[PDB]
Structures are given as C-alpha cells and as structure tokens.
Amino acid sequence: QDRTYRHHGPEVSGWFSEQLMTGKIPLTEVFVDPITIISGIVRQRVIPVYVVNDLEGICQHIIQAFEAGVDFQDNADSFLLLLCLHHAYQGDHRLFLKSDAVQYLEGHGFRFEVREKENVHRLDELLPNVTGGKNLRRTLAAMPEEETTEANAGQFLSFASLFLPKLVVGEKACLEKVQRQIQVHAEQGLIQYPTSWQSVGHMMVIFRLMRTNFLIKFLLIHQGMHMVAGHDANDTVISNSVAQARFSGLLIVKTVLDHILQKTDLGVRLHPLARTAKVKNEVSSFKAALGSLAKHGEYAPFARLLNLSGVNNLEHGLYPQLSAIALGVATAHGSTLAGVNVGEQYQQLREAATEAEKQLQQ
Length: 362
What we know:
By secondary structure, the protein is mainly α. It has 15 helices and five strands. The protein folds into two domains: 7-33 and 248-360, no CATH class; 45-140 and 154-244, no CATH class. It is classed as viral protein. Keywords: Complex SUDV NP-VP35, viral protein.
C-alpha cells in the first residue's frame, strides 16, 4: 500500500509545542541549525531552615505579620518556607530537602541550611543578624502574641496562589482576577477566605510579595504539580491556580509555534516557508531561545512568571516573519491569533502562507 498523502494542518492542539518547550521533544526533531570559578559568578542565596516545636504557632504569627502589612524586604524566604513546610510536608523538612525541587533550586544558587532552634519566643528570634535592617526585627518584636487571624498556613498559600495566573499582566488585572476567582471558589463551596483578606490593602500586600519573591512562587508551583493525593480544599485551589498559570506570558508565542508546525500523514515538521534562507536567521534565534527555555523542563511553562533568564527573548514581536507565517496559516482556517499583528512589510510572507495552506487542503 503506497503512501496515502493527507494534510492535517497546524498543531492547534498545542500538544507538540508544549513538548518542545518543556524539553520532552528535542528541538532537532523540527529544526536543523563550561563556566569556571575564575570566569563566572554565582550568587549563593542561603535559606535558613528553622526546625521548631509548635510550627503551627509560628505560622500563625507569620500570617498575622503579613496581615499587619509587615514588609519582609528580602528576608521573607525563611518565613514563607516554614509555611510551605508546615502545609505541604506537614513538618517533615528532611523529606523536602531530598526533593527534586530542592535540587532544581540549588541550580539557581539556593543553599538550604538547617538551623535548630529548641524554642523561639517570636519571629524576631528567627532573623538573627548584627547588621541587617532592624526596622523589621523591631516590628516583629512589637507584634502581639495574641491570636487574631481566622486562617492558617494552607489558606495563606492557596490565597497567594490566586495571584499566579495574571501576575505578569499587572496589578489591576491580577487583583481583578483574584476577586473573580474568590467568587468562583466561594460560590462552588470549595474555600472561603477571611473578609479582611479581600480588602484592597491586603490584596496589594500579597501582590507585592508574590511579584518580588521567587521562592514562594516556585514552592506553590511545586505543590500544585507534584501533589498526587490527599488534596485539601487548599491543595485543590493551589493546583487549579498553577494549572491556569501555565504558559502565562507565553501563550502568544506558543500559538505562533503551533501554526508554524505542520502535520501530515508522516508526522509533524516545520512549515516549508519557515525553512527558506530569508527566515533562517530568525529560526536560529528562535531555536536558541526555546533551547534555553526547555532546560527548565517541567518548570518551563512558568518561565515568564518566574522571570527566568532569557525568557525575554521569547516575545513574538522579535519574530515577525514567523508570526506572519503563523497568522497566514491561521487565517486560512478562518481562525485568528490573539495579540498577533503583521505589519505591511511581512504581508507578502503572510499571504504566501495563506495561499499555501488553502492549496494543501485537497
């Protein structure tokens, strides 16, 4: 039986482009084409891992500190880690230190050092230093030992996760997304957060925290993907939040990639118009950018959210020719690509792709 040639068009499913961006399919399947201590610099970020009795109590104090609008400038990691330790790992810090997630973080220069504190009076005791900013230490010491918060570590984390999906868009779009999502979860009877948390003041505090702190974002993403069973109401929210945040700030370039990929009866390949000499330079840079992205594996889809290096090179605007081919193919199927606009200079390439597609549809 000879070849039954069939044209199926672009990979609008998004499956193939996802595998390419997460390193599960090598880029050579579609495309073609050591740093030393004396040459490079690695910034180590030491994160104290405080083992403590009454981890619940300390977590309540941490929550109440955030509720009071306390701004942990760059000493938030230790306290935020205790929240994640208490909720996700239920106290077991040693199991966490063995995770593949910690190994990945050690790639980012993170160094987790355990520090045993038999008993700590308050949060001021968990930030020892003779030189650092003392405004926080005095503030944390000024915090009352009174229990005031209505929530727990789980709710704080699930609430924070709501900021992930639209974090990269801006403060207005993010907060509005949080508000809508809170209503969805509340109406469906999944979770109900404290009233005071939904105030503009409190939401702004959590927004500034999420936007500046890499670790809390990563740990939520870690929890959302690698939690396999025993899901709380909180775990469910977190998993849903992380799922929605997938490829946030990368959706446009991803659809461009989808439409420059062509599927036939033989398999998937790059669009012929993308294989011309005129565009080979753009494809080379694009492959290099995807390669840098794919090294992050299962964390690649949150690359723009986590502000990983090189992700700026994935803005579709940098690839007008590929965008043109992508839109050219899209328009042939009566479809359109959101956020993609081809200038007059590339319309000829755009029309060529359109005419090419409507030709192949036999």
